[PDB]
């Protein structure tokens, strides 16, 4: 959107000791991950190895603002996910708890031992509160 396109441009100027929005691929990942991504050293290659045949190895806004202008498609599910989270949060405390995750599961068909479940909360828990908040429930479903 206008705002989206107004964001990729925002953070882009957070780290560029060049000034003219002319960054490097050495820091391109530092830009995509800080803004919500986790690409591999390979994904940086093939992509940048098509539009940037300049040989300079530098990047600007118009360039970057078009690359994400593709990936940012099937990923936009953000919504569905957020609505999904709210489905689990049966109590509406803002966090998904074992007891809750149990229901969502048993009622879906897959029964789980009070053990296996408490495992899913822990492998999904990133801050130890023993519960998953949207922020978390997001990573667990994105990265």
């Amino acid at each position: 959107t206008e705002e989206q396109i107004a964001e990729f441009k925002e953070a882009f100027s957070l780290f560029d000791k060049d000034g003219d929005g002319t960054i490097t691929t050495k820091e391109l990942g530092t830009v995509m991950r800080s803004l919500g991504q986790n690409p591999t050293e390979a994904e940086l290659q093939d992509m940048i190895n098509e539009v940037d045949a300049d040989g300079n190895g530098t990047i600007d806004f118009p360039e970057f603002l078009t690359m994400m202008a593709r990936k940012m498609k099937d990923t936009d599910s953000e919504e569905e996910i957020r609505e999904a989270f709210r489905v689990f949060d049966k109590d509406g405390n803002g966090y998904i708890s074992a007891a809750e995750l149990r229901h969502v599961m048993t009622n879906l068909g897959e029964k789980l031992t009070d053990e296996e479940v408490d495992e899913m909360i822990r492998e999904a828990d990133i801050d130890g509160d023993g519960q998953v908040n949207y922020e978390e429930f997001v990573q667990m479903m994105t990265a």
Partner: protein
């Protein structure tokens, strides 16, 4: 205990043809899924029943609820229920003016005819009474009176067409005045002929039982994930199935934005009434309100048929929401509320509030990285350390699931004070924009409650006095370790 209506008194207040609301009990039970309907022009009911074609989504003119044309959809929207208000009665016609041209052939307009029977139906509801006779150039007209001041109507004896004109003295909302002219109603094409349109059954929300959704997922794609060694790639694949098969909806050609179980659940409904006899075709033409994000309507009374065939009727939003909290969203059903509810809808600029749990907590959780940046985005609508954006990208480090809770709490609580620090000195430098200065006074607070929370979960500023801002490495970390014990 919440003061809602039930059974008969509820159905009556709804608008749905009785036979139909009954036919719906079935499907509500058969699929254990709550059916929630939006109001329905009461003057439309008897029309629906007699078999009038309800209006699809390609027609947006409002139905009238007064005068002789009550129940139908007047072409001159000033005869609609929005009578009297301009920007509305105006944005109305334009809509009609479009349905007639951009759908040439599919939708048209025709003269209103009140047959001998309907007239009575109206004399009963006390909407219009057949008055004295009148002759105009060899034509017998019977006047039709209403308690309305601007317009005056009458009906012909030959073909039963109704006409209206402005009353000597008054002026249309749009500022007009005219003399005797046919009242035109929005019609639809059926077998080459034009048939009038009445209200349609607008669905507020559809919420089925979580199990009912399972049936949707193919017992093949399910197992594939149900049987995954690891646990993580499992939850993801699990949830993602709930998404893909129950939560997600896409735009359809004429049903607006809906999902698939909805398309079926929808279709079953229209069929269900065709069985009782409604010959006018469908009677539910578009997806549920919660998917209407451009022109959201906030109705006081909502009609609810529960999976037990019972009848309810929320007395008002606050309550409509209370009922959805205690019987649907907190009882293991599939439910999602419109995405524009606590935002300004773009279409009509509406601002419909709704209780969103994810936000309630917002205050007690520290911000991710995007939220930070994207907040520096929508923050620069009024109007250099990328460390705070990193420390924030560190806190939610997926590569955290190998450590133990005890561990997690530590590095995080630390990663918090680490981010809460690189923020303190940014403020200790230039008050940049008065409003940015606030955002941070805010984060600093969210950072607190979160950090503090992790500590009380296990063992604030107190500890912020003893620590190294000064050099930089793991050395700073080392001092920390001990402190927590």
């Amino acid at each position: 205990r919440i003061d809602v209506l039930k059974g008969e008194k509820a159905l009556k207040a709804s608008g749905l043809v009785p036979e139909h609301a009954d036919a719906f009990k079935k499907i509500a039970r058969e699929l254990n899924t709550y059916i929630l309907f939006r109001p329905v022009n009461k003057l439309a009911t008897n029309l629906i029943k007699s078999g009038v074609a309800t209006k699809g989504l390609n027609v947006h003119g409002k139905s009238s609820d007064w005068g002789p044309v009550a129940g139908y959809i007047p072409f001159d929207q000033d005869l609609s229920k929005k009578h009297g208000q301009q920007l509305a009665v105006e944005k109305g016609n334009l809509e009609n003016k479009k349905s007639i041209t951009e759908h040439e052939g599919e939708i048209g307009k025709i003269p209103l005819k009140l047959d001998h029977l309907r007239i009575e139906e109206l004399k009963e509801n006390g909407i219009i009474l057949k008055g004295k006779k009148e002759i105009d150039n060899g034509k017998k007209y019977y006047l039709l009176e209403s308690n309305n001041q601007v317009y005056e109507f009458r009906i012909s004896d030959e073909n039963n067409e109704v006409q209206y004109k402005t009353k000597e003295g008054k002026i249309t909302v749009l500022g007009e005045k005219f003399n005797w002219r046919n009242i035109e109603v929005m019609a639809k094409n059926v077998e080459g002929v034009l048939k009038p349109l009445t209200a349609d059954y607008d669905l507020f929300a559809l919420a089925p039982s979580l199990t009912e959704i399972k049936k949707q997922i193919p017992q093949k794609e399910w197992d594939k994930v149900v049987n995954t060694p690891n646990s993580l790639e499992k939850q993801k694949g699990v949830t993602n199935l709930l998404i893909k098969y129950g939560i997600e909806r896409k735009p359809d050609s004429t049903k607006g934005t809906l999902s698939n179980w909805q398309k079926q659940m929808l279709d079953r409904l229209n069929e269900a009434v065709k069985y009782t006899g409604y010959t006018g075709g469908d009677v539910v033409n578009h997806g549920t309100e919660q998917d209407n994000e451009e022109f959201p309507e906030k109705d006081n009374e909502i009609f609810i048929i529960n999976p037990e065939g019972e009848f309810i009727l929320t007395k008002n939003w606050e309550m409509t929401g209370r009922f959805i909290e205690k019987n649907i969203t907190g009882k293991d059903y599939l439910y999602y509320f419109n995405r524009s509810y606590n935002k300004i809808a773009p279409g009509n600029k509406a601002y419909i509030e709704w209780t969103d749990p994810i936000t309630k907590a917002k205050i007690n959780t520290i911000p991710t990285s995007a939220e930070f940046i994207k907040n520096l985005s929508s923050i620069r609508r009024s109007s250099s350390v990328k460390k705070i954006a990193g420390y924030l990208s560190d806190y939610y480090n997926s590569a955290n699931h190998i450590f133990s809770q005890e561990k997690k709490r530590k590095i995080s609580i630390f990663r918090g004070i680490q981010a809460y620090n690189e923020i303190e000195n940014v403020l200790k430098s230039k008050q940049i924009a008065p409003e940015y200065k606030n955002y941070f006074q805010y984060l600093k607070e969210r950072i607190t409650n979160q950090v503090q929370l992790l500590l009380t979960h296990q063992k604030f500023k107190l500890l912020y006095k003893q620590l190294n801002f000064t050099e930089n490495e793991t050395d700073n970390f080392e001092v920390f370790q001990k402190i927590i014990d």
